[PDB]
Design a binder for this molecule. Structure first.
Ligand SMILES: CO[C@@H]1O[C@H](CO)[C@@H](O[C@@H]2O[C@H](CO)[C@@H](O[C@@H]3O[C@H](CO)[C@@H](O[C@@H]4O[C@H](CO)[C@@H](O)[C@H](O)[C@H]4NC(C)=O)[C@H](O[C@H](C)C(=O)O)[C@H]3NC(C)=O)[C@H](O)[C@H]2NC(C)=O)[C@H](O[C@H](C)C(=O)O)[C@H]1NC(C)=O
Length: 77
């Protein structure tokens, strides 16, 4: 299973808003993974698992068309 990260935010409201926006551009599960990093809480907006590289590429394209960020492959944390 393949995963994308679309953004990482200190503001949880920004992360939740991006998660909601992404649900309108992809059918893959969208979730927030929040971690302690550099003495702060970081809210990572992620999606997956995606079943194939081709679907990852098309999902990246749809996120860029929606101007929602520069999505990068991440391995699940
Ligand atoms: C190889 O290392 C990895 O590189 C990744 C490169 O993509 C990196 O991920 C990125 O991390 C940056 C921070 O380091 C993160 O940047 C946030 O960027 C957004 C813009 O997209 C900021 O949001 C905007 O802020 C302005 C004002 O500053 C607002 O006016 C505007 O409305 C905001 N936009 C939205 C949509 O709300 C955001 O700042 C806001 C203020 C916030 O924190 O709430 C930036 N956050 C921070 C904390 O600086 C960027 O989104 C992220 N990109 C992706 C695709 O995830 C990896 O780092 C992240 C943190 C991670 O590790 O998960 C690098 N990994 C490591 C281990 O170093």
């Amino acid at each position: 299973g393949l995963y994308l990260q679309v953004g990482a935010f200190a503001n949880p409201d920004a992360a939740e808003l991006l998660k909601a926006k992404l649900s309108g551009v992809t059918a893959a599960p969208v979730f927030i993974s929040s971690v302690v990093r550099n003495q702060q809480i970081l809210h990572r907006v992620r999606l997956g698992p995606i079943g194939s590289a081709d679907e990852v590429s098309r999902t990246q394209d749809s996120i860029r068309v929606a101007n929602l960020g520069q999505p990068t492959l991440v391995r699940p944390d």
